[PDB]
Amino acid sequence: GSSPKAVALYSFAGEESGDLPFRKGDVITILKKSDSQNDWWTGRVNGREGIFPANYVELV
């Protein structure tokens, strides 16, 4: 089954208040996902919770 966590492949800055910023190499706790990486998921990292592009991470 799907990993609890993912690692960022690229940095993501976000654009709006509910987004989840991170840098390459950061370890994100995945709180909600779909079967698609061509989608946005919900995660927790760097003291925040929010959404991010799923093609920016690799499941651990």
Partner: peptide, 11 residues
């Protein structure tokens, strides 16, 4: 390469 195109935001 450059960072990739993002998916469309979710509905």
């Amino acid at each position: 390469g450059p960072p990739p195109a993002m998916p469309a935001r979710p509905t």
